[PDB]
Design a protein around this ligand. Structure first.
Ligand SMILES: COc1ccc(OCCCCCCn2ccnc2)c(Cl)c1
Ligand SMILES: COc1ccc(OCCCCCCn2ccnc2)c(Cl)c1
Lengths: 255, 40, 273, 236, 273, 59, 40, 57, 59, 40
């Protein structure tokens, strides 16, 4: 009586149940694991807070309306302030982590709409100015708020044009990245497990984000007659196999 | 025959002949069998 | 290898063509799941689509130019093209970029090939024979200041001497600080409020300095340098969506404003053929 | 001293060679490789992942909407969409498949075309997708369409339908750039019965459509893509 | 091997020289069936009549020309021969055509050899040294528009760089969509009422683009390109009648009107020697 | 570096040679051969089929 | 010795030494013996 | 080859970090004598610092 | 005479090569080596000897 | 393969792979053990 459909994920002191899942994706078919010695470089023993950092943090909720263009969060940024995960983050020189991402959106059998939930490794954004204008730090570190693709261009911020993925590629091809759809008629959640993907064994958690999670409405939300025209979307994310190394004074970052 | 000492100096590599699209085409956690229902 | 097996009528409870794309998988459906097929063999291996093959041919990565002329009274050799640099790239000439940026991370040995040809746009009695010197004055390396500085001794610094009209070849292992080169980097060099963004932060590998070794003849001679790059021993990770809009800058993803629709509009209906 | 003779071609530079060259910086020492998920070995590995087709090409500036094929409730017998199968041009051209095919001169193989339905769960519909092999015109009505490769799709719990365009061909390779002799057919879709919405519901519903290549597929003779060009070298 | 065996007088009921040609056979009659012969050996193998040998020597297949000159103010490089194409053939220069068209279907590897020589028809101080670039901008491939377009980066597209006066060689497998190249094709590309006829429909393999890499000197330099083609690994099917009338077009069988009698008229009688 | 000497004829192009040359487009992949009746191997095979002689040349 | 990797790059092929004119000179359905009458 | 071995807390009478430089020696002290380390390998031979290489171009 | 083809790079001088060259003065005869204390093999050997740092740079 | 007769004409030497800093880092007459007191 197991269905692909019902699932339970327990991680730390927190549990999620979905009764309307559509399997789960594990990026590149690899599950998060700690850093092996053969791959290690820094000689420091690392710190593995385990259950105090590897639990589920639910970010603040978004509201899908007929005019929504899509939202974008960066990792580990989105979690920069969650509990002890965040403290560890500002206090060590280097850290490394994988995540379980669970995006939630329920409706009824009269609604229609379909969101794309995708994880993009190394999502370098484009400046809407063109040329070689850079995208300032603050703009690519929105924190739990994430970036709202239907917000206005700002100065020093990225471009927010959806048919171009914020980088000069077409929305249609985002499907080459680990992703899952939430089609109100099928699905009510999306779950993706992200292994740590980098060109170095461990890195800085503040100067470099290693994935952007993106939720994009593709088939517009259509509510039943005289229904309220909107649904909330909630994102809950859990660091998994986290390791921190090179402890010290506590980083100070712009803004 | 390599005439040179360093590995960078050798010619192109030879075909992976690796080929396994499943990391890209089927990264699902619970295995899906073709023919069985997608969602049970 | 069979490309298609023989398959006949079906009347089952087992439907391989109905799936749920919401899952993120592309189910491996074949012609024989939905029509009646006959056996056929592949006769093919997929040899020429190997990434080593795809990135393994020489591509032009840079065209620069230097001239041989009397430096007498020149206050700025660099500025007179008495010598000239090239901030090592591989993302300036877009033809090989799209190719490369089809991948996130990528590791490959290298084989550089330099063609140099001369031009004599104004009245010369003859064509002189010039020898070019090409050098690697990287990060810490004293940069040439004049076309005949102590720098050009380059006794610790690699440097090539070939003739204009000829070609200079050589190869190089992966000299990238990390395990792979980042084709993309969503980071900064530090948490500064105004520091630059992209990969322009990482792609650190000094520049190439070219110069003519010859002193000047009575006429002036323009020498134009073309650098070709061939990846050998390629390794690529994490495929990405291909580049759709035009490029504007080395190392940023930025596209031009008021660009044009990249998807061709139908001449007719959705229903049109 | 061993006697030699040099042949025609000596001194040429062919950008498509694979010979040895000295190592500029010897005794160097690369940085070790660490493990990174996601390694690609063949472009054939990636063109099997499906991506969305902007089938609804009828707009005037690129929009998220050209990915949506609309469906109308209560129409009978009528046609949902049509397209030829020049995978290197037209709707296909910006898709990952289209985009890679363009790096090669010839292609052969089967294509997989699937449609995922997004209408309310309490609605229902039966569509017919038809592949018309080279030699006939794009079908003009379902009767015409139904006599070639087709699948009646019944919209249900299982949200997507995967149609295969089996390789139908005299010549074993076709050109990726559209060519007549080498042309591959048409793909059309019609109401089999009709879309029906539940009460309290209204308007258009949309289908999303994807394209990917079967394991069947072959691409050969690499060349340059018409999809990218430039007028001056970029700088930093 | 015996070329003739010894044979003596015959008075038989078994007549090998009477046959019925209406049958379509050529009965294998020998000298020894009708005169008295002596033994003789062949001393010969028929080596130099092998089709590999017959089609295996280089033949000139194309002569084109490009010039190096100041492109300043040229509105159409292609038109100024600032660069130039060649719609790959093998049926333009008739000497190798007749040879090839002796066969219906034919399959053979290839080995191209390009000679480039320069001419300076009007007053120059000297002869410059130019490097030619030869490229394959086939079906889908961006065609060069100017002599220095992004196209010439050719980073996925094969291209040769050699010096004028020298020669550029290389070879190529059978890149023909079908199992053999059709020397003839009695068909159309589709059932259109006005579409073209011949093999001009099939022989699709883009063109070759040549250009000089050098910028301009003070004088102008004419470079004339000659492409030679040698078949290697030849396979030929279905022999046909040799070409009798002159050729008029690449790819059609058409002969010129009011052509001349191709059979030599006797100077004398049927009875004449 | 192995010492060599080049002989007379170096650099010449003889259209009647049979030496090796690089492959412009590597890792390519030809199309398979199918069977076709009629293969010719030697011109000596075909000159044994008889054909008509315009003997009456007097026109 | 081939110095190159691809087969197209090898020199000319070597003599068929096949030679069988009968597909061209005697494509008759019922075999004709020299010396026996052509038409019986 | 290990570049660093794994080493944990220490509370000893054996102090490798106190020396007398007046002796003229450079005592071979390592990270693992004064912090807690994890194993890591060298992955490197020191090829390009050989004097033959240094004076050989 | 053995057929050859020369590749791109022929005739170049790369100051970072390691090939053979003839001996200008053959049958010479070096002077024997005697023992000398102090041989260095790697620069890695010497950067492990400590030296003083002008830390007080303020002059 | 050496093509030449004299030893000077051969290419560069090959890595010492000798490496022993103690003549430079620990030339003390009485051996010092790390961890034992420097001056007893
Ligand atoms: C002329 O002699 C040289 C001696 C050594 C050299 O090394 C060059 C190393 C640069 C590799 C660049 C690869 N890359 C750069 C950015 N992405 C990929 C060079 Cl380029 C030249
Ligand atoms: C210059 O580099 C090249 C790289 C690849 C090339 O391939 C050419 C293939 C054309 C074969 C033509 C054979 N043919 C054409 C019609 N009948 C016979 C060519 Cl021609 C040149």
């Amino acid at each position: 009586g197991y269905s692909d459909r019902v699932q339970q994920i327990t991680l730390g002191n927190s549990t999620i149940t979905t009764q309307e899942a559509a399997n789960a994706v594990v990026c590149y078919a690899e599950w998060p694991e700690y850093l092996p010695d053969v791959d290690a470089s820094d000689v420091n023993k690392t710190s593995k807070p385990d259950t105090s950092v590897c639990r589920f943090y639910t970010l603040d909720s978004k509201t899908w309306t007929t005019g929504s263009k899509g939202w974008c969060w960066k990792l580990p940024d989105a979690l920069k302030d969650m509990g002890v995960f965040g403290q560890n983050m500002f206090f060590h020189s280097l850290g490394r982590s994988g995540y379980t991402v669970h995006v939630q959106c329920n409706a009824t059998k009269f609604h229609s709409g379909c969101l794309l939930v995708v994880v993009i490794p190394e999502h370098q954004l484009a400046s809407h100015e063109g040329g070689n204008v850079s995208v300032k730090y603050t703009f690519t570190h929105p924190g739990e708020r994430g970036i709202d693709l239907s917000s206005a261009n700002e100065v020093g911020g990225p471009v927010k044009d959806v048919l171009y993925n914020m980088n000069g590629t077409l929305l249609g091809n985002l499907l080459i990245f680990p992703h899952q759809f939430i089609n109100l008629r099928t699905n009510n959640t999306a779950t993706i497990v992200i292994p740590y993907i980098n060109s170095v064994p461990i890195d800085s958690m503040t100067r470099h984000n290693n994935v952007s999670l993106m939720v994009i409405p593709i088939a517009p939300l259509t509510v039943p007659t005289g229904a309220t025209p909107s649904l909330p979307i909630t994102v809950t994310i859990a660091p998994m196999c986290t390791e921190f190394s090179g402890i010290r004074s506590k980083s100070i970052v712009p803004q | 025959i390599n005439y040179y000492k360093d590995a960078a100096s050798t010619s192109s590599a030879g075909q992976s002949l690796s080929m396994d699209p499943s990391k890209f085409t089927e990264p699902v956690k619970d295995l899906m069998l073709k023919g069985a229902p997608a969602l049970n | 290898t069979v490309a298609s097996i023989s398959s006949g009528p079906k009347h089952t409870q087992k439907v391989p063509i109905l799936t749920a794309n919401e899952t993120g998988a592309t189910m491996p459906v074949l012609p024989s799941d939905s029509i009646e097929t006959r056996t056929t063999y592949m006769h093919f291996n997929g040899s020429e689509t190997d990434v080593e093959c795809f990135l393994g041919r020489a591509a032009c990565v840079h065209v620069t130019e230097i001239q041989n002329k009397d430096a007498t009274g020149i206050d700025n050799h660099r500025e007179a093209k008495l010598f000239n640099d090239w901030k090592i790239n591989l993302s300036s000439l877009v033809q090989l970029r799209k190719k490369l940026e089809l991948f996130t991370y990528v590791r490959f040995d290298s084989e550089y090939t330099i063609l140099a040809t001369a031009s004599q746009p104004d009245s010369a009695n003859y064509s002189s024979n010039l020898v070019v010197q090409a050098m690697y004055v990287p990060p810490g390396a004293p940069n040439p200041k004049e076309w005949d500085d102590y720098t050009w001794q380059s006794a610790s610094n690699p440097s090539v001497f070939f003739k204009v009209g000829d070609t200079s070849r050589f190869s190089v292992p992966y000299v990238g600080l990390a395990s792979a080169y980042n084709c993309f980097y969503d980071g900064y060099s530090h948490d500064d409020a105004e520091t630059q963004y992209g990969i322009t932060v990482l792609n650190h590998m000094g520049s190439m300095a070219f110069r003519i070794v010859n002193e000047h003849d009575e006429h002036k001679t323009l020498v134009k340098i073309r650098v070709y790059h061939r990846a050998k021993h390629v390794e690529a990770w994490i495929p990405r969506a291909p580049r759709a809009l035009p490029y504007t800058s080395i190392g940023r993803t930025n596209y031009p404003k008021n660009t044009e629709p990249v998807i061709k509009k139908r001449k007719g209906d959705i229903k049109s053929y | 001293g061993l006697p030699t003779t040099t042949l025609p071609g000596s001194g040429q530079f062919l950008t498509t060679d694979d010979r040895q060259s000295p190592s500029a910086l010897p005794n160097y020492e690369p940085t070790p490789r660490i493990h990174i998920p996601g390694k690609v070995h063949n472009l054939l590995e990636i063109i099997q992942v499906d991506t969305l087709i902007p089938m609804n090409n009828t707009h005037t500036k690129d929009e998220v909407n050209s990915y949506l094929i609309p469906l109308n409730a209560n129409r009978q017998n009528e046609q949902v969409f049509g397209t030829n199968l020049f995978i290197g041009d037209g709707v296909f051209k910006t898709t990952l498949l289209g985009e890679i095919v363009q790096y090669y001169t010839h292609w052969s193989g089967s294509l997989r075309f699937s449609l995922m339905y997004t209408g309310p769960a309490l609605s229902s519909a039966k569509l017919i997708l038809a592949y018309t092999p080279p030699g006939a015109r794009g079908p003009q009505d379902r009767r015409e369409a139904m006599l070639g490769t087709h699948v009646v799709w019944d919209i249900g719990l299982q949200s997507t339908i995967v149609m295969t365009i089996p390789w139908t061909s005299g010549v074993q390779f076709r050109y990726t750039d559209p060519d007549t002799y080498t042309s591959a057919g048409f793909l059309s879709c019609w109401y089999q019965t009709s879309l029906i919405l539940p009460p309290e519901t209204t308007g258009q519903v949309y289908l999303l459509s994807f394209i990917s290549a079967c394991p069947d597929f072959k691409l050969r003779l690499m060349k340059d893509t018409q999809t990218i060009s430039q007028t001056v070298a970029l700088t930093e």
